[PDB]
Amino acid sequence: MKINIRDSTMVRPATETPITNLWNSNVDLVIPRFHTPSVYFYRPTGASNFFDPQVMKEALSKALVPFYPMAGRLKRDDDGRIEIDCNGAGVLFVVADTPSVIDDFGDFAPTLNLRQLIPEVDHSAGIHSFPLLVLQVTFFKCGGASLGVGMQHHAADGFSGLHFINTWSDMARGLDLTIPPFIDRTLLRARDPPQPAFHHVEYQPAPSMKIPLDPSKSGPENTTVSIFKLTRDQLVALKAKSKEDGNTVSYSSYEMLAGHVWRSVGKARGLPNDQETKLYIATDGRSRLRPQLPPGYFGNVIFTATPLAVAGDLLSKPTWYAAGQIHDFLVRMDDNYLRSALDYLEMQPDLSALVRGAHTYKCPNLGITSWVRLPIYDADFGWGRPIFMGPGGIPYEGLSFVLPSPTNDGSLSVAIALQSEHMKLFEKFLF
Ligand SMILES: O=C(/C=C/c1ccc(O)cc1)O[C@@H]1C=C(C(=O)O)C[C@@H](O)[C@@H]1O
Known about the structure:
Blueprint: E1 4-11, E2 20-22, E3 35-42, H1 53-63, E4 73-76, E5 82-86, E6 91-98, E7 133-140, E8 145-152, H2 158-172, E9 223-230, H3 232-240, H4 253-268, E10 276-284, E11 302-305, E12 308-310, H5 311-316, H6 319-330, H7 335-346, H8 358-361, E13 366-370, E14 388-391, E15 399-404, E16 412-419, H9 420-426
Parallel strand pairs: 6-7, 10-13, 13-15
Antiparallel strand pairs: 1-6, 2-5, 3-8, 3-14, 4-5, 7-8, 9-16, 10-11, 10-12, 15-16
Helix pairs in contact: 1-2, 3-4, 4-6, 4-9
This protein binds the ligand O=C(/C=C/c1ccc(O)cc1)O[C@@H]1C=C(C(=O)O)C[C@@H](O)[C@@H]1O.
PDB class: transferase
Keywords: phenylpropanoid metabolism, bahd, acyltransferase
Assembly: monomeric
């Protein structure tokens, strides 16, 4: 797979936008470190029109007016806290061609070479030196096209990011903004003085391997990225296994599936029985906060659930015990818990230490982030909804994504990075 860059524009908002410094909340900071990668694939309609760069760039310009922080830069304030400099510097927009065809990607596992569909960002220079959002339209030999998105994590979680990408697609089709973005993260400010009510397991360091891992089997260089589809048959069977061993409790489809992936990764890694394994669950707090955030709220509302088990229990007990741990952590996260979380973060001297990253998800642990409830298939720019949308790469061993079906057949996909030798075994997930 070879990419030939054709054009490259720094697209700025269509009109003047507020010059201001946009404050980041604590959950805007403890978010992962770079640009969240996502990719969209589109069949050709047969039209010459197809993903016309001018249409895209003009629509992008317009959308960058209500969503003007998206065209800003990272900077530090006087106390050294990272904030968004709303300077309207612009968004990088690349047009590329490739002799490859879409079908060459087979199943769209977010491998390294799929990452090639998003432009690369050099973070090693200034914090201020790179766009918050990088975009690439790649035209394939088959007439199809892909949209690679790389959005700096401080700017937006999935709900706010797709609020922009979809408003953009709407604007490309001549439509107007629907829900205007609410741009003020101070709603997620910690109380004064802070007052944690809980011990937040989610922000305690992840279990390490009791036995150090072989750096030739472990590490970035010998990790595989695959995806797997589960049919609604397999999912229905899965939720029904809540019955097993006389358990009367009914857990959610997401709980049983997450528990199943967690348990299946555990078996695959051949963990010792006394080894602890921590599951990281990105959790939208929009529905839990009880004053309740405005529609269009622009930023991160990601809070974090972290069920934990000893592999001995996790692998020997039925799947619903895993579901139980997950449920027990998810159900505690009401508004009172999330307010605690903000206060707890506030009382840490160095938030950079809590920024989740490779060390967070790597074996013996696991991250599972659900995109199932995200409107990922709504980006229609005038030539149809995408046939596929998922992560643009999974850079961290141990991180995984749950994607919804592009066709509403009740199937789900798990996209995941594991160490090579564990990946084959991880088909054990189709038990
Ligand atoms: O899900 C997201 C971002 C999604 C997103 C999708 C489309 C966009 O246009 C913009 C953002 O962030 C997550 C944060 C992580 C965390 O909180 O640990 C764990 C990671 O797997 C994951 O990337």
